[PDB]
A = this chain, B = another copy of it.
Amino acid sequence: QFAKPEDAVKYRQSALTLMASHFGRMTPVVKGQAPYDAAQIKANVEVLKTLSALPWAAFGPGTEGGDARPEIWSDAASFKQKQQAFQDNIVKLSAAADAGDLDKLRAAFGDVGASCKACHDAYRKK
């Protein structure tokens, strides 16, 4: 859907920005600094699930750019593995949110966070 590689870069950065907000906004709830409203968390995680599928299609062949390391393309099986793992952790977060349990949510939120750090260490320029 991108007329130029620059557009793919803008798209994935924008998707990632939105994901960061939707993930990050739950941190005070997970730490107990803000109240836990099960229906609010369920809705937000549903948004996060939608968003979390979107960036990966914008790292297609020939969309080198931004802070993406070339390793994303020269090691494509491994990158696909990492995004698929991350999306699996999101499914677990969605399951915790649907169940309405704050202990399961905290655990699942940590797994998501570690999936994020893992990928960045490997595939994002510092």
Interface residues of A (CB under 8 A from B): 1-2, 7, 10-11, 13-15, 17-18, 21, 24-25, 47, 50-51, 54
Interchain nearest-CB distance for A63 vs B (Å):
13
Q: Within the assembled complex, what's the spacing in Å between the Cα atoms of A10 and B18?
A: 9
Besides the known contacts A11-B17, A14-B17, 16 further A-B residue pairs in the complex with CB atoms under 8 A apart? A1-B21, A1-B24, A1-B25, A2-B21, A7-B21, A10-B17, A11-B18, A13-B14, A14-B14, A14-B15, A14-B18, A15-B18, A18-B18, A47-B50, A50-B50, A50-B51
Q: Within the assembled complex, what's the spacing in Å between the Cα atoms of A51 and B53?
A: 13
Q: Within the assembled complex, what's the spacing in Å between the Cα atoms of A29 and B74?
A: 33
